[PDB]
Amino acid sequence: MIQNFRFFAGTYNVNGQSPKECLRLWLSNGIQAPDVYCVGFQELDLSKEAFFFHDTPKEEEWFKAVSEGLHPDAKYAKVKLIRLVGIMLLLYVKQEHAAYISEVEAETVGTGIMGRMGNKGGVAIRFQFHNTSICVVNSHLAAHIEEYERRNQDYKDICSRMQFCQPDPSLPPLTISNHDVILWLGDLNYRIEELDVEKVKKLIEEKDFQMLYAYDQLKIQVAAKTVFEGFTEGELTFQPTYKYDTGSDDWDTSRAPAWCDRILWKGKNITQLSYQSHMALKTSDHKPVSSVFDIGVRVV
Ligand SMILES: [Ca+2]
Ligand SMILES: [Mg+2]
């Protein structure tokens, strides 16, 4: 029997900052309490120290910040936390679902310096929920403005190198694609091309996000089948989420605005209820993005 549960997916590039703001706006702003929360960060800590010895007080800081921000109408249990340098993913479920979560595994893949360090890359948590297999990936891909090939390479390398082991020590490992349900979120860093920074801002003024999409690097590459084969993205009905002046909604361009921050998915029995950014949070040069899904899970 398929029963629907509500999944919240969120991605936020916090530009090396500690949380200054209440996250309720992002994580529980006029939504029903999700059954499951998948919350992704990039650039959690930008220090060389963090890049070097992993430890950083930004982890407890954003964890406290997310937990305080979850929907107040339910109690949530943290299932798993995973981080590679500045890339962190948190998985929470309502306390009443905890017993039905199993085979939780978490892995990381660095795809930055030398094609292997964690300045860029991916982290993932997969698990079983009742009798449905789910994998959630948070990734931070190459930032070069022109050279999207580097993002495609990061994406190809997360897919080929991310391997989850299994209790049975005689079985092959699982890859990201070996799941009934895949959610992929992150600062994917694809930008807008050809169009002038003037036109790109003006298009954003009059809210004509359809025309702009035709020049979005991610749209183009997905159609070219160089990444995200089989994935869907909901219509982008919110303005690009990068790059803003910290503490405001004005632009900064050291580089047109861009839909850096995205959530895609593939699987049967997945319906997307919403796809938003959250302008009111001004702690970072990105805005956070969120999506709620009704996902059908097989319950036996
Ligand atoms: Ca790379
Ligand atoms: Mg930054």
User: Where do breaks (C to N over 2.5 Å) occur in the chain, by preceding residue number?
Assistant: 254
- Any idea which ligand is nearest the CA of 285? 2
CA dihedral 61, 31, 25, 268 (to 10 degrees): 60
Residue 120, annotated ligand binder?
Answer: yes
Which is nearest to 87 in space by CA: 136, 127, 124? 124
CA of 254 to the centre of ligand 1 (A): 21
87-94 and 76-84 as β-strands: parallel, antiparallel, unpaired? antiparallel
Which residues are CB-neighbours of 135 under 8 A, at least 6 positions away?
124, 125, 126, 127, 164, 176, 178, 179, 181, 182, 183
CA of 14 to the centre of ligand 2 (A): 8
- The rounded distance, in Å, linking the Cα atoms of 100 and 196 is 51
CA of 146 to the centre of ligand 1 (A): 14
Instruction: Report the amino acid identity of residue 49.
Output: E
State which approach was used to obtain the coordinates.
X-ray
Q: How far apart are the first and last CA of the chain?
A: 7
Residue 61, annotated ligand binder?
Answer: no
- The rounded distance, in Å, linking the Cα atoms of 45 and 15 is 8
Place of tokens 């749209």: 219
Which is nearest to 263 in space by CA: 84, 11, 75? 11
Q: How many of the other CB atoms lie within 10 Å of CB of 245?
A: 11
Q: Quick one: resolution in A? A: 2.7
Residue 149, annotated ligand binder?
Answer: no
- The rounded distance, in Å, linking the Cα atoms of 252 and 246 is 9
Place of tokens 């702009």: 212
Q: Which long-range contacts (CB under 8 A, 24 or more apart) does 198-204 make?
A: 200/256, 200/257, 201/251, 201/256, 201/257, 204/239, 204/240, 204/257
- The rounded distance, in Å, linking the Cα atoms of 247 and 258 is 18
CA of 27 to the centre of ligand 1 (A): 30
Which residues are CB-neighbours of 114 under 8 A, at least 6 positions away?
none
CA of 286 to the centre of ligand 2 (A): 8
Instruction: List the domains of the chain with CATH numbers.
Output: 1-300 (3.60.10.10)
Under 8 Å between Cβ of 126 and 150: no
CA of 270 to the centre of ligand 1 (A): 31
| Three-state DSSP class for residue 96 | helix
**DSSP secondary structure code for residue 95 in this structure:** G
| Three-state DSSP class for residue 238 | coil
Residue 119, annotated ligand binder?
Answer: yes
Which residues are CB-neighbours of 205 under 8 A, at least 6 positions away?
none
- The rounded distance, in Å, linking the Cα atoms of 157 and 175 is 12
CA of 111 to the centre of ligand 1 (A): 4
For every residue of 10-57, DSSP letters joined together read EEEE-TTPPP-S-SHHHHSSS-PPPSEEEEEEE-S---HHHHHH---T
Peptide bond into 243 cis (omega under 30): yes
- The rounded distance, in Å, linking the Cα atoms of 39 and 49 is 24
